[PDB]
Every structure is written in C-alpha cells, then in structure tokens.
Design a protein around this ligand. Structure first.
Ligand SMILES: Cc1ncc(COP(=O)(O)O)c(CN[C@@H](CO)C(=O)O)c1O
Ligand SMILES: Cc1ncc(COP(=O)(O)O)c(CN[C@@H](CO)C(=O)O)c1O
Ligand SMILES: O=P(O)(O)OCCCc1c[nH]c2ccccc12
Ligand SMILES: O=P(O)(O)OCCCc1c[nH]c2ccccc12
Ligand SMILES: [K+]
Ligand SMILES: [K+]
Lengths: 253, 389, 389, 253
C-alpha cells in the first residue's frame, strides 16, 4: 500500500520511472531464488513482482510456464513462498512487494485469510490474474482491510467504463492509443501506471516513461536469463545484474 | 451481462480482463440468436438433416426382465459423430458465424469434442485448430487422425500434466489474442459465463425430445432421468426440460474410478472442494494447498477435474442428486448392454446405465420408469475393454 | 415356389436337395409375414425405435460448389450399427422367430454382417453363430470382439482361401443339418431364392424414404441414384422403389480395385462370366476352367466374388447401369467427403460417392440431381486410409 | 447308362449288393490317384464315384475338402481329370464310372459340351451335387442325349412328390423310415438305390443291402485311408485293398 506511495514520490523527485522485475518464487530453487531476488534489488529494482507457483497458469506464457515447472520440480509450495516473502521483507524494508496470483490460491482457504497472511509477511499488493473487475469485490475488500493494494490490469481493449472502475478500485499501481489510457487514468486519478507489454529492452523502459507511465514491468526477459544460466548459477546472477542495471538506467535516462 | 452468470454461488466469469469483451460479445450474440427465428431454423435444419435428430428412445426389455423397472435409453449414440457433443458444437459454430468469425479454437481430453469441432467447422467452412493434451494425443490417435482428415489443425499441449485441463489452458491463451477473429468452442457446460448457459441451451433438445417420446410411449413422465457427468453437458441437456417437473428425479453420475476412498476418481461435485478455475467457481479436484489435480476414470471422457456450475447448484438445492459409479461397475454395465440389447455404449454412458441397473437390482419390486441418457457409442472403447478382458 | 426365383436368366435355387425344404419353408414364411400387419408393425417398430429410422437425407453443398450438380447423401451411416446391414438383419431375425427358430447362422467378409447378425440376435434372444474367413478374423479383429461382446459364437473358416466365399460355404454346410431349428441369415441380396427377394424387401425402406425425402426437399425425383455393389443389398434397397420411375437413373458401382485391366478387381457383373455358385446363376469372378476366384478391393465389404441376380437382370435389360471405381478414386472421395462435409464414409460407400463426383466433374455445367447411398460410416477405415496416408 | 444295367443284373444273379468307393481325382497326385483307383477296382469295387476338384465344394465335408486341397496342390484341373477318366476306361471296360460334380464345372462352357466330353471318355453317370430336382432340366436333358445317366439324391427329408420326380428323372442309380424310401422308389421303379449315409464299416454294407438297397457308397472312409498313409503310398494301397475287400465281402455276405 504506502510503500508504493513513497517509492513513486521519491522517483518523481528524482524525475525517474520505476523498473519492476518479475520472477517466480522458488525458481529454480528456494536458495537460488532468494539470491536472484537479492541480485535484482542490488542491481536496481525499484519494486518486485513475485508469482507463487500454481498448477494451472491460465494467463501465463511459455517462459513463465517453465518457471512454474522448475519451481514445482523443486517442490515449491505457497506456504514456502510466504516464508520466502517474510525473509525478503526482513532484509529489504522499503521495496514494494507485489504478488502475481491466481484466484484459487487466494480463495482456497479463505480470501480474507490470504490477505491477512500477505499483510503479516509484509506484502504490499496483490494482482489476481484471473479475477476481472467484475468479480473483484470480495478480493479488493479483503485486500483493503488488510492494507494490501488491489492491483488491476487495464487491458488494450479497455473502454471508458473500465478505465473508471480500474481507477476507482486499484491502489498502489495500475497494471497497464497508449497515451489515451495513460492520460485517462491520470484524469480519473488511477494509481501510477506501470506498463507490462513485453518489456525486454532499455529503450522500452524510457519509451514507457516518456509516454507518461510511472514505470515498466519486465517478466519473461528476467526469467529468460534464469532459464539460460540454469547450469551456471553464478553467471545467472551476473547476467541478471547487467540486465537490471541496464533497464533501471533507462528509467532515469 | 444480459443474463445471470451465477447458479447460486457457482459460476461467474473468472478470466483475465482481456477476455471479458470476448465473453460479453458472445453473450449478446447468443441472446440475439435465441430470439432469431432464422438462427433457430438453420440450427434445427442441421440437427435434423445433418446430425440425424431426433434420436430414438429405445425401451430395453431384456435387461429389466424380472424386475418392476422399465428402462428407456435416449440414443445419443446414434447421433452423427457417435455422441451428444455434435449438438452444441453445431450451434456454437453458427454463433461464431453470426459474429462474423471465421476461425474456431477447441480443446479435448477424449478426442470426441475435437472431432465434433472439426466436423462442424468442415461443414460450416471454419478454420479450426484443436488443442489436445500430449498424453491424450497418443491415447486417442484414431480421433486425432479423424480431426486431421476433416482439416482441423490438431495441436498437442505438453504443459502441466499434458491433459484436458492444460489443453483448456492453451486454448484460452490463444483466444486471449485472437478473440477478434476466432471463437473458442468450449466442449462442456462449464467454464466462464455464458458457456454453461449456452451449452445447456444447445443440448436441451435431448431432454425435450425424451419428454415428448416418453409421453407418447408411456403417457407419463419418467420417475427419473440418469446421465453421466464429466463436465456436465449431456446431463444438463437431459435435465433442462425436466427441471420444472418436480416429480421427475434428476440423477447425475460421476466417475468413482478405482473407488472414492482410493482417491483415484473424478467426482469433484460430491467428493471435491469448491475452488476457482477454468473461469468459474465450482467444486473441483484439488490438493489441500489449492493446486488442481486430475480426475481419474476408466473412461477418458469423464476426466474433467471440475463440474458445471449449474450441476453444483441443482445439487445444493436438492433438485438433482449425484452419485458415483466405479470402473468395474461401468465395465459390467458395458458388458450387460452388449449381451442383452445389442448396443455398445460408450464407457462414459455406461456409468449412467450402471447406476440405473443398481436402482433396479437393489429394489427389483420397486415400480420405476427410468431414462438413461446414452450419450455416446462404445466402438471407441472395444480395445480398452478388450485389454481388461 | 410361391414367387419367381428368377430375374430373367439369373437366380434360381442351386443348392443340394437336402436344403430345398428349408428354402421353401423360408419363402412361405416371408410371403405370410409380408401379408401380416403385425409382422410389419413390429419390424417397423424395431427399425424406428431401435435402429433409428428414418435416416437423414443430407444435401451436400460444399462438394458441388461451382457445378450444376446437387448432391444428396442417404445417411445409412447413421443407422444403428453404422451400416445398412442392420435393416434386413432385423427382418430376417423376426422371420426366424416366425418360423419358431431359436438359432441363427451367418457369414462375413468385413465383420459388419456378423456384427449386425450378432446385435439382432442379442436383441431378439436368438442363439447366433457366425462364420468368418480365417484371414478376415485377423483383419477385422475389432468386429470380431464386438460379435463376442454381443454373445454370438464366432467361427473362423480355414477352408479354401479362408475368405467370404468359403465362409458362405461353411454356413451352408451347417444349415444342411440344422435347418430344422436354425435360420441361415444371408448377408446380401444374392444366394438362392428367396434370399435375393427377401433382402431387397427388407432393405427397400432406404429407397422409399429417399423418394419421400427428395420430393419433400426438391419437389421432384432425382436424375439418378448411385450405390456401391458388393453382393447388391444396399444398392437394390435404394433402387427398389425407383424401378418403375423410368426417368430415374439407377447406377451401381462395382470395385475396380487396382484397375480392371490388372485383373485385381471385384466387378463380376461387368467384368466376369456367368456361372453357378452360392446357390444362384449369376456373373462371377472365375478362371477359364470355371474355378471361382476372389474379388479384390481396398474395401473388404466389396469382396463378394459374384453379384445379386436382380442386378445382373436390371443390367441386361438396360434399366440400371453398372460402372467401376478404383481404390485410388474411392480413397480420394473418402478424403474429399471428410474435408468438405465433415462426414467419414465407409470405403465401400466411397465408391458410390467417387462415381457421383466423376459425373459432376466431367460435366460441371450439366444440371443434375443426384442421390448417393451412404451405406456405412468409415470409422472402421481410418487405419487403412492412414496406412496409405 | 447301360453299364449300370449290366452290373446290377449280374449282382442280382449273384444275389449280392454293389460296393462303390468314392475318391477325388488327382488326390494326392495324378499317378498316385490312378494307382489308388486300380487298387480299388482290384480289391473289389463294383463301380466308381469320382469327383473333380472344385474351388468351392458347397456340399463337401472336411475329409473331402482336404482331398480337394491336396488335388489342387498337385495342380489337378478338370481337363486333367478327363484325361485320367479316358485312361481308367481304357483299362477297365465294364465298371460303371460315376462323376460327383459341382454345377459350375458342368455349366462353365456349356452343359451339353460337358456331357459330350463325358460320353467321349466313357463316363456312365453324373451327379451334380448342387443341382436339385427343381433345376435339373437342362442337365438331365443334355445327359440323356449323350447316354449319360443323370443321378439324383433322394434326401431323408423327401416327400412323395420328390420320390416320384427322382424315380422319373434318375437313371443308372438313385443316390440314397429308410425302408419307406427304398420301397417307394421300387414302387415308382426308380433306378437301383445306392445308400450314401456315411458308410465306413462292413456291417453298414450288409445292413444297406438287407434294407433292400442295391448297394452302398463309401467316400470319407476311403479318402481317410489316403490322408493317413500320405507318407507311405505303398501302405496306402495295402490299407485301401484291405478296406475295399472287407466292404465288398459284406455285400455278398
Ligand atoms: C460420449 C461422451 N459422453 C459424456 C462425456 C462427458 O462430458 P459431458 O459431461 O460434458 O457430457 C464425454 C466427454 N468427453 C471429453 C473428454 O474429457 C472431450 O473432450 O471430448 C463423451 O465423449
Ligand atoms: C457399409 C457397407 N456397404 C456395402 C457393403 C457391400 O454389400 P452390399 O452390396 O450387399 O450392400 C458392405 C459389405 N460387407 C460384407 C463383406 O463382404 C459383410 O460380410 O459384412 C458394407 O459393410
Ligand atoms: O512476461 P512479461 O514480460 O510480459 O511479464 C509480465 C509481468 C507480470 C506477470 C507475470 N505473470 C503473469 C501472469 C498473468 C498476468 C501478468 C503476469
Ligand atoms: O463321405 P461319404 O462316405 O458320406 O461319401 C459320400 C459319397 C459321394 C460324395 C462325394 N462328395 C460328395 C459331395 C456331395 C454329395 C455327395 C458326395
Ligand atoms: K468431472
Ligand atoms: K461383387
């Protein structure tokens, strides 16, 4: 919730956009994953988007699907993910931590209980990929009473009626003609927008910021590096560091 | 939405925001189509002159000899394709055309839906691409070749457990970007609204026909109508017209597999927990964590790890009752029908027959008029049964 | 006899004296049965509520697009069992019962007749024993298992070339001593009188239905009706009701196999010599000596080395015309139907379709209303076709 | 035709019945077959029943079916059978020679021509197994004008109407309560009856003669011996000789 407030305010003072990498928790293993995350943070990540391995990634492409398989191969479970989350927060007090979730893991044994666990471990926001604005009521309500920011996706095929809902319901950040959506969101005072359309190059980050977005999210590009250096964990880290620094450099410059 | 997406607490539209317009477009098209005399006339023409409707209602005397049970079988096994799937697949294809769509996307476990999707598309000049679970590809090779012979592009899914649920996953992935020109032809009365409603309405002729046929032959409604339940389309198709006839029992039969207690089954409605997936809120096969599992059964057609929301609702209010039948029970029913009536039922349908046989045998002096929905033929199952015997 | 055993010079009752009483008994039973309102009522009931009659008449627009040809397919592939054989097999079983017989004897090449014989017997409580050619046993294993699942006793014949003709030989051998209690259920409109007449009358509903359906949809009779010809039952069933309609062409299609000139074919009516065997005088595949040979075809169902006597006669007087279609032509027609209409025809029926396609393609501007008898479904043929492609 | 007349007259003077063995021409080979026939004649056969190998023996049991297979394995053809017939007649002037035929080999290239060939080689009678009294007209007519006796089977399920036809149509011999048929045939003056119901033992021959039959025909029993001694042609002959002498002894005694 508020960690996003502070970050975006800071970034604005510095006149720079936010670069947020996404990774699957426990991919390719708990220890290596924890190290990957520390490297992302150390390399320049302003916030984090973390997914917990789900059996059926309804809205996930190949790269991420494979991340889930590797995570599951390591026996990663949501309970293990929450343990990782607490540890990450204990080491990094201010980075906004966002969760990329699937509805069943949230609903499984109580929506409210899920948001209670999130608040307990220090999570800041939760994006339920398969819960559209039309079914969000119980999720956004439980999120708000646990000081968790409910994140909503503003798709390309979004009408004005959807823009208004997203602006009214979302908190922390809005998962994003482009300038039209961006300016309409700002008009409706939606949470700062973070672009998420396959961002894999430095030029894409500056472009997103120049368009009026508060930042850009990169997922597949990050995971790709992991998949490539699966046999060389140290080289994985080194490459991750280079990528993140490159992407972050592109948000200020 | 124009219509209620929920059946009590079950149902909804749990899909990524990007797919909502596609769902809304489809619902509007369906609603307009249902009010269109010409859409209905063409749908009916295809059903009659192409698919072969109405299907027969066979009274089976040999099997009930010595009991007070009178059994009739609704012959969906005689429908073009050998199963009930053809009915709704034809309506959905006409719907896609109504929307100006030229392409079709579909998913399969047992190759029946993909085959039905491929046949409808070939008939209506639609570009069809099917998603089959990699494992099921090798298991249902005959159905695969059939799909290809009918020009559909078959695509195996190696993701997850490479089965129906993962196939349903890939089809959605595709649709998310192609919805503008392609229609996702869901194979059962499950998934996000309006699919559970659409599939029921495009299958309801099974029950409407059964009603007229039973009134004609018996002069009364049956005491109960029984049908197997994988995702729920053949069952809801039979149930639909009888829902307001309170005296008629509606019995759904889920696969008990090797036995409920063994955990190796596919009966989520009565032995699962409510979750959210496949774009809906319904009971499903899942771990304590909330990870979704597979449904086991001797019959591949009953491997959907969840159930249609209208079934879960009809159960909750006590309108319909759901039971389970083991592989061995289905196998026996399969053998009995072949020997006593000269009909080879699909192992799926055999679960419905198996239950009707149990109702008869347990209380042989109980006078009862039963109707079993014979959803498909078992030619496809002779090998499987032969491997067991 | 009560009826004429001959169609011109073709036909007769060329069986050992011992079997004549059996033939005479059967003829009397048939004649009485045909005059019996109740026999007809029960036969009709089985055809409608058990077999699924009437079958649909599908207009196939996609295949004739761009030509002046309008093609309709008589859907015998939708009949219970997947082929036209069920029709007459049901009537013969009722005939056997009329005679107080409790057992059935049958023969097969492609397991379809044995399966149809097994299903009818299971339905009517008859003890059935089938004779299959030893070679065909392994070729048609699925059909074998089906026969067994329906309780019929399957018996392979290792005599002669171990095919249909030798199977027909064994069945007769059996009947010679058991005629008193068993009925020999001949599978086609061939053999000794009254079989050619009986099989036609019990299959004539195909043509009677086609007539009503074409008059209803088109308001006129077709220019021609086309059907494949193995032994002649599906063809004569279609032809029967149109014989007196002089304007309607009757086209029978024999298997050309690898080509007439290669000698590897099964077209005795147009490329054989009249002989005496199978209890009748008709054209047949035979050596210069008079030894009978086998008919070759990609489709096993068209392997009868002879032809029904009524076909040979209708040809001699110019009422019907017979042509041949090669394996490759049938295969192509098979592929075309799957891709353009979403229907998998039996390779047998594909020969009829192949000819209708030739009539269309050779003269695309000729206005013609054609009806092809789709005698059976090709699910059984997907492997064969798949081995070729 | 007349050879039957003379044989039956002779047998009657001797007060004995006729023993007639059946064998397939060319089984198991032309030379061995010719030898088998000479041995049958030498052992006591009063007449011969010879079958020509046909592709589809509509009315033949296993034993005989196998005879056809062996004959066909040796490449025996009807043309070869007629050559054998001429040779057999040239060696034995008086034994009645009867043919057991199937309709197609007779009809193949002219019924009349077939009977002409029979008369030419010295055949006495022809029984077309698959031509019932109802279809015999052209066969019996062609037979009679070529001095060949048309043989008819008087089955067990024979009515009086059939008995009269068989009596009127048949010549040479009639292929046969039993006493009823026998006496009715004699009443109708049918050709001498030769019983053919699986005769394989000496007692069966005396029984047939005692019943009023002019003799008995033995087929399977004869062929059986051949099938057994297929590996020892000389022992085949020796066994055949013993069997025939035994059977013939039973017709007089
Ligand atoms: C004859 C028949 N009857 C019943 C069913 C089960 O589904 P239903 O409950 O939706 O009717 C099937 C399903 N078959 C599924 C397999 O998961 C398919 O993709 O085709 C069927 O083939
Ligand atoms: C679908 C279909 N259509 C046509 C035929 C050919 O025979 P028909 O000419 O008698 O109709 C067959 C024959 N089938 C024979 C094989 O010789 C049988 O014993 O079953 C068939 O299976
Ligand atoms: O792969 P990219 O670069 O397009 O990442 C996008 C980032 C967040 C993300 C990760 N997994 C998802 C599943 C559903 C919705 C959004 C996501
Ligand atoms: O085998 P058996 O001893 O009963 O011989 C019977 C003799 C003549 C005979 C040999 N083959 C046949 C075929 C049809 C009709 C009669 C015959
Ligand atoms: K299920
Ligand atoms: K033929």
């Amino acid at each position: 919730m508020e960690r996003y407030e502070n970050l975006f305010a800071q970034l604005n003072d510095r006149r720079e956009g936010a670069f947020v990498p996404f990774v699957t928790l426990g991919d390719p293993g708990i220890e290596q994953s924890l190290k990957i995350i520390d490297t992302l943070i150390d390399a320049g990540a302003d916030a984090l988007e973390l997914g917990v391995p789900f059996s059926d990634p309804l809205a996930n492409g190949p790269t991420i699907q494979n991340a889930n398989l590797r995570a599951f191969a390591a026996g990663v479970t949501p309970a293990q993910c929450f343990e990782m989350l607490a540890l990450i927060r204990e080491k990094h007090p201010t980075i906004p931590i966002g969760l990329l979730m699937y509805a069943n893991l949230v609903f499984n044994n109580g929506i409210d209980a899920f948001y209670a666990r999130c608040e307990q471990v220090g999570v800041d926001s939760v994006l339920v990929a398969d819960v559209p604005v039309e079914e969000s009521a119980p999720f956004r309500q439980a999120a708000l009473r646990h000081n968790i920011a409910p994140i909503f996706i503003c798709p390309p095929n979004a009408d004005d009626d959807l823009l208004r809902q997203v602006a009214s319901y979302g908190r922390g950040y809005t998962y994003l003609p482009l300038h039209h959506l961006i300016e309409k969101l700002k008009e409706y005072h939606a949470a700062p927008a973070l672009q998420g359309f396959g961002i894999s190059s430095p030029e894409q980050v500056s472009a997103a910021v120049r368009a009026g977005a508060a930042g850009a999210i990169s997922g597949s590009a990050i995971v790709k590096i992991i998949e490539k250096n699966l046999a060389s964990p140290k080289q994985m880290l080194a490459e991750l560091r280079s990528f993140v620094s490159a992407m972050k450099a592109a948000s200020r410059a | 939405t124009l219509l209620n997406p929920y059946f009590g607490e079950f149902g909804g539209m749990y899909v990524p925001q990007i797919l909502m317009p596609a769902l809304n477009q489809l619902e509007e098209a369906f609603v307009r189509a249902q009010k269109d005399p010409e859409f209905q006339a063409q749908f009916a023409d295809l059903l009659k002159n192409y698919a072969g409707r109405p299907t027969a209602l066979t009274k089976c005397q040999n099997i009930t000899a010595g009991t007070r049970t009178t059994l009739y079988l609704k012959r969906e096994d005689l429908l073009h394709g050998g199963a009930h799937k053809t009915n709704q697949v034809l309506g959905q294809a006409l719907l896609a055309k109504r929307m100006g769509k030229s392409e079709i996307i579909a998913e399969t476990g047992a190759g029946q839906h993909g085959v039905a999707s491929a046949l409808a598309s070939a008939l209506l000049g639609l570009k069809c691409r099917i998603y089959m679970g990699a494992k099921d590809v090798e298991r249902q090779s005959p159905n695969v070749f059939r799909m290809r012979l009918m020009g559909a592009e078959v695509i195996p899914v190696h993701s997850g457990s490479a089965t129906l649920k993962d196939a349903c996953n890939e089809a959605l992935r595709d649709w998310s970007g192609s919805y503008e020109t392609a229609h996702y032809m869901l194979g059962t009365a499950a998934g996000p609204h309006p699919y559970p409603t659409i599939v029921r309405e495009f299958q309801r002729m099974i029950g409407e026909e059964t009603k007229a046929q039973i009134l004609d032959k018996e002069g009364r409604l049956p005491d109960a109508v029984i049908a197997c339940v994988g995702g729920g389309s053949n069952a809801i198709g039979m149930f639909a017209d009888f829902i307001n006839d309170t005296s008629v029992g509606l019995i759904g039969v889920e696969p008990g597999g090797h036995g409920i207690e063994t955990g190796e089954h596919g009966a989520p409605l009565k032995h699962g927990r409510v979750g959210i997936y496949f774009g809906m809120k319904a009971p499903m096969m899942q771990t304590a964590d909330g990870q979704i599992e597979e449904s086991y059964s001797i019959s591949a057609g009953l491997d959907f790890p969840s159930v249609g929301p209208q079934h879960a609702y009809l159960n909750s209010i006590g309108r319909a009752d759901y039971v389970s039948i083991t592989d061995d029970e289905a196998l026996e029913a399969f053998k009995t029908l072949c020997r006593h009536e000269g009909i080879i039922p699909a192992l799926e349908s055999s679960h419905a027959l198996a239950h009707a046989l149990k109702m008869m045998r347990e209380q042989p002096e109980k006078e009862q008029l039963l109707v079993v929905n014979l959803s498909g033929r078992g030619d496809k199952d002779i090998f499987t049964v032969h491997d067991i015997l």
